[PDB]
Enzyme design. Structure first.
Site, PDB file in Angstrom:
ATOM      1  N   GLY A 197       0.782  -1.218   0.000  1.00 20.80           N
ATOM      2  CA  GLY A 197       0.000   0.000   0.000  1.00 20.80           C
ATOM      3  C   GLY A 197       0.819   1.275   0.000  1.00 20.80           C
ATOM      4  O   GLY A 197       1.771   1.412  -0.769  1.00 20.80           O
ATOM      5  N   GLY A 198       0.452   2.204   0.875  1.00 20.80           N
ATOM      6  CA  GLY A 198       1.153   3.476   0.958  1.00 20.80           C
ATOM      7  C   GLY A 198       2.673   3.408   1.035  1.00 20.80           C
ATOM      8  O   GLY A 198       3.355   4.311   0.543  1.00 20.80           O
ATOM      9  N   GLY A 203      13.297   7.968 -36.277  1.00 21.73           N
ATOM     10  CA  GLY A 203      12.979   8.568 -34.992  1.00 21.73           C
ATOM     11  C   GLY A 203      13.936   8.257 -33.858  1.00 21.73           C
ATOM     12  O   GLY A 203      14.186   9.118 -33.024  1.00 21.73           O
ATOM     13  N   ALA A 204      14.459   7.034 -33.819  1.00 25.32           N
ATOM     14  CA  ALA A 204      15.381   6.614 -32.770  1.00 25.32           C
ATOM     15  C   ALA A 204      16.690   7.369 -32.886  1.00 25.32           C
ATOM     16  O   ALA A 204      17.391   7.563 -31.896  1.00 25.32           O
ATOM     17  CB  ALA A 204      15.644   5.118 -32.857  1.00 25.32           C
TER      18      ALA A 204
END
Lengths: 518, 174
Positions: free
Chosen positions: A172-173, A408-409
């Site tokens: 959890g937290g 793009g790379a």
């Protein structure tokens, strides 16, 4: 109560009781129980003969659920500061022997005070986590506590290095503060796990009971989720690595990374790094061997070593100065960049920039991993993070294209228009608008079928394109690369580039912040 | 939500949170895809933000998701709660499960207790008034007043100025 000499004696008794963190059974159950105690971890981490612990006796103020019954000085966490290799470093270490290292309101406020002091004086913060989560007995006040810690994590983000050692059963937290830090070092066999939601709310939604140790453990986060940056097999190795990580980092964003060697064997290289790259363009090689011959003594602290292995990220030193390296890995997915890889590199880049660490790019990438899976998981937005990280960064940036650099790379690895200060290419470099084959096809769409073989032209076109464009000299003639250089010159070239870039200052438009793709 | 939060803050747009959430989607698929680092983005986005922020809990807000929707310690300027609001450290059952062990299999009572203590806990905690008594929420309000309250709150916060530590930028989880 009149004697003073008697009071100093009682103080010693009280502190001796507080050090036990409740459980001379529990802490004594320290040197052969699997894990070390909060204090033992702190003893290993700090030089130790010059410092202080803050809020040593602070206890919970809650009464409900027998919380008035117990005392437990410190309320489950030891906070304060010390010296690590002679540098001031703050830290907290949760004590699992105290209510499962539960996060009580006071416990949270001690961690916060620690972060506040660290922020005020510009010192790093090391969080040795060993908590099961929220202290149920304190209700919403425990959640408030977490909220206060988180807020500090965000305030300190990019101002002071934040390292977390996950040495406990986080649920959890307990997982969110570590996530907000810059690096998570987790033990596989000495520390154990971390997950937002436990097996209980899901174990009635399937049917497999996973005993205890490393369930949604280190292996999962270090190889699949990318939540863990370093995975070690021991707590001693966890602390040793923390020290080593601190040694490459400055104390805050106002200081230059530490120069711990400051030796300048930068003079020159003669260890034929060019033999690494195979004569055959389709064969792989270990890109790490290239960074080894470039950096001081071949040292390299790799980050996210077992996650998104298609790109390499880590710290090293050139002429004694620390550098950050981002390099495509030919041995994994043919060096193609991934959603995980893009995330891996993007955060390392921003981190380096925030703490003034120069960035060196070593390039050999054909593009991105194809597939409806990647697109469906949004490679479009994840890949943009790298473009954002490099463009955003103002630290010195130098690119060395060792082999492939397509589409793009090519841009994502850092090019001039994106803000690269210097770009160099080995004679073996191959820059292209797109894969040669992919380029030739479209570039001769109608032909290829009006000749003597639908496969003939893919040579007189595919092989010729590479000879006239799959080279460093076309981009060099257009001013896109500053120079083409001999592989053995890379170190001397990076040395001179960084030296000149040392006092680099750029410009940026005023904004509370930007809006990078998430 | 993280990117929406950061975008609004960057362009001075007030943020209103309307809460009713039990927590996070469980399972290996989520954990394997890193819910830990993705979930943290909302915490960062809200804490980071300096525009006016007001939270209105309409129903539940448990555990980590409660914090992620923006609470005072995280930086919410104002927090209000409907009489139906139900704030809890975790799901009441998961809570009761723990808070009532040592007495769930040892008590001479079979297993109808989990439903009773689950109901008592909800009556004892699953109510806006506990959080309100601790200063966690500024006030509990009549649903129909939600608009009036947001109006007054925003009117007052319109000239809000906070304070941020100098940095090139931060390192939000990616």
């Amino acid at each position: 109560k009149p004697p003073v000499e008697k009071l100093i004696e009682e103080l010693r008794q009280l502190k001796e009781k507080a050090y036990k963190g409740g459980g001379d059974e529990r802490i004594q159950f320290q040197h052969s129980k699997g894990k070390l105690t909060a204090r033992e971890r702190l003893a290993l981490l700090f030089d130790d003969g010059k410092f202080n612990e803050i809020m040593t006796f602070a206890t919970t103020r809650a009464t409900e659920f027998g919380l008035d019954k117990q005392r437990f000085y410190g309320d489950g966490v030891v906070t304060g500061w010390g010296k690590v290799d002679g540098r001031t470093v703050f830290a907290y270490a949760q004590d699992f022997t105290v209510l499962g290292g539960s996060l009580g309101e006071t416990h949270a406020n001690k961690i916060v005070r620690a972060y506040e002091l660290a922020l005020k004086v510009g010192a790093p913060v090391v969080g040795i986590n060993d908590s099961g989560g929220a202290r149920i007995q304190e209700g919403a006040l425990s959640l408030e506590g977490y909220g206060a810690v988180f807020k500090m994590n965000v305030m300190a983000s990019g101002v002071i290095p934040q390292i977390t050692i996950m040495a406990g059963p986080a649920a959890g937290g307990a997982v969110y503060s570590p996530a907000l830090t810059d690096f998570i070092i987790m033990i596989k066999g000495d520390a154990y796990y971390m997950f937002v939601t436990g097996p209980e709310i899901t174990k009635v939604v399937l049917g497999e009971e996973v005993s205890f140790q490393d369930l949604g453990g280190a292996v999962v986060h270090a190889t699949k989720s990318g939540v863990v940056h370093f995975m070690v097999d021991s707590e001693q190795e966890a602390i040793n690595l923390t020290k080593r990580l601190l040694s490459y980092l400055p104390s805050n964003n106002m200081e230059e990374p530490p120069y711990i060697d400051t030796g300048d064997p930068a003079d020159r290289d003669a260890t034929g790094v060019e033999q690494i790259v195979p004569n055959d363009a389709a064969k792989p090689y270990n890109m790490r061997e290239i960074i080894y011959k470039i950096v001081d003594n071949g040292e390299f602290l790799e980050v996210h070593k077992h996650w998104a292995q298609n790109i390499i990220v880590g710290f090293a030193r050139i002429a004694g100065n620390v550098v950050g390296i981002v390099a495509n890995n030919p041995e994994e997915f043919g060096g193609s960049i991934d959603i995980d890889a893009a995330d891996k590199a993007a955060r390392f880049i921003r981190f380096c920039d925030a703490f003034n660490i120069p960035l060196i790019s070593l390039v050999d990438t054909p593009g991105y991993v194809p597939g409806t899976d990647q697109e469906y998981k949004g490679i479009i937005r994840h890949g943009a993070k790298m473009l954002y990280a490099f463009a955003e960064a103002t630290v010195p940036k130098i690119t060395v294209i060792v082999r492939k650099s397509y589409g793009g790379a090519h841009i994502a690895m850092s090019i001039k228009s994106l803000g690269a200060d210097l770009v160099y290419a080995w004679p073996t470099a191959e820059i292209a608008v797109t894969g040669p084959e992919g380029a030739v096809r479209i570039l001769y769409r109608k032909e290829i079928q009006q000749a003597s073989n639908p496969d003939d032209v893919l040579k007189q076109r595919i092989a010729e394109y590479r000879k006239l464009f799959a080279n460093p000299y076309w981009a060099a003639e257009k001013g896109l690369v500053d120079d083409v250089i001999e592989p053995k010159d890379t170190r001397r070239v990076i040395v001179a580039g960084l030296e000149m870039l040392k006092t680099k200052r750029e410009y940026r438009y005023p904004k509370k912040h930007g809006n990078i793709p998430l």
